[PDB]
Amino acid sequence: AVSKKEVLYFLSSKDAESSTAVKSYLKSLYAGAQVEATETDASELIAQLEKKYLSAQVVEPGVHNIALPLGESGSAPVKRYAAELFNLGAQAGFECPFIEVSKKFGQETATSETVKDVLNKTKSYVSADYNAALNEVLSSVEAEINGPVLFDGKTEGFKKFAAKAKAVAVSRGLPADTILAYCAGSANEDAADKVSKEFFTWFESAYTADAAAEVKAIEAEAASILDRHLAKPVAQIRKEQASAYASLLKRAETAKGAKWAEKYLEDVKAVQWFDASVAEAPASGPKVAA
Amino acid sequence: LTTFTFSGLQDAPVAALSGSIKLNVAAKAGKAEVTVAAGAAKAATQVSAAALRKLSGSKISLAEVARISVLHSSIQNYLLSLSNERYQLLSQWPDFTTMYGKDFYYRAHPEDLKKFYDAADEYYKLYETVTEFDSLSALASQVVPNYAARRRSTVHPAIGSTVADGAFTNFLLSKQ
Amino acid sequence: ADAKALDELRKPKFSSKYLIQHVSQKLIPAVK
């Protein structure tokens, strides 16, 4: 039972249980059913809350369909993984991640006038190794001026702070001039394209290093989990996993009437069907109706 | 794929590269007389110029049937490829069963023989736990929720430190 | 029975999606 705002998110979605709900909804609209009125109310706080809790319903079936490139050599499966995350973010309603984190920056420090409270209100959304390297530059400009350097653009203190911050940015490894000349725009399409290609080269290396860092975290977690598991004798492993499986079954079995409980138990029935169907003919895979 | 593709009978592969399957076409004006041989079965048919264009009309859309999910199966495949790297060094364990005879029992120190039998039981423990392969599907669900809540971001699923740092330069170094 | 479907078998199984649906159903009327 789709609620006319959930189905508007699943129209461009490409996973299974959302598209099946859309197909049932569109076959309902084929059999002479009216579409509900889309509600033009619920001022912007509830709007962004519904967007936040509705793009998660498109992201969460979409992450579990995206295979990690674990243990792979090369930047081609890492780029496959980051591209699938990009297509998932675009299906769920997000924009480019550059644009979305710039929007988070502009939404965070819209009412801050000093650079120090910009660095203290965008603290979570930047790395600590970069926030410290900006805080020391800000402290040096505070030693040079002995007055709070304001975040205006026409204030000259911000200019002599940014002239060091560009050197900080290029010494971190990211070309600040290429990024600024992309996101400012250019005169003709040739000198705009000449910096668009270089910003997309940096951006490709940026999200590829991001996905590679995520995959190295999952690889280290899998190695630590296995090396802690291979130190146990087998009976301890079997009783621990039967205890975990039974306790997480009964955590869904006590709660009854909800959608996630029946979906969990229908999924356990589907997993047991998969084990039976691979038992019936194991050299040909599971039986799919075709 | 897109809705309009433009491939077929034009800069196409006309001959095979493998000795296991032997394909050959007849590049005529419009049509093509193919002949394909894969072992003792043979097929030699004819495809029209407007017959490969309608091949990409219906889309295949290959999608995977997994036991739990493609994420969980990829994590479990990695855990199995780690179990193999442990198992390959349990494969190089020196054969202690050649020294079980009583001409090594009564020649050796009592404490060194107790140490040796403890080492053999330790090998049997390591080998019986590295080949508990059905526990990998439960270990792989101890990586799934932390990762899947990492991708449940308020910003973007594909976000990371480098993109946010580059856009923090773009936010800071532009005016206000 | 056996040979279920393909679009029924493309579902990622133990994904959340419904704890999210439960919170979005018990939060949005109560925050409105």
Partner: peptide, 30 residues
């Protein structure tokens, strides 16, 4: 094989905390 369902969001953007290498290869070679 089944996992605890979590419903929480990650607001901060951190480096993903690459964990330490365990000693299992060294201990089994020993």
């Amino acid at each position: 094989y089944l996992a605890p369902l979590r419903s929480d969001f990650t607001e901060e953007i951190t480096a993903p905390k690459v964990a330490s290498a365990s000693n299992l290869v060294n201990e089994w070679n020993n």
